[PDB]
Amino acid sequence: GFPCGESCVYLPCFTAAIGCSCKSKVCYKN
Numbered sequence: 001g002f003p004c005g006e007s008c009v010y011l012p013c014f015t016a017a018i019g020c021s022c023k024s025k026v027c028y029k030n
Helices: 014-018
Strands: 002-007 021-023 026-029
Touching: 002 014, 014 026
Parallel strands: none
Antiparallel strands: 002 026, 021 026
């Protein structure tokens, strides 16, 4: 539910390293 401070408009979420995933162009976790 919280943004991870990373766009995934183009690139993937490298914040996947701390559990974030791309949700409609915004990297998010819980």
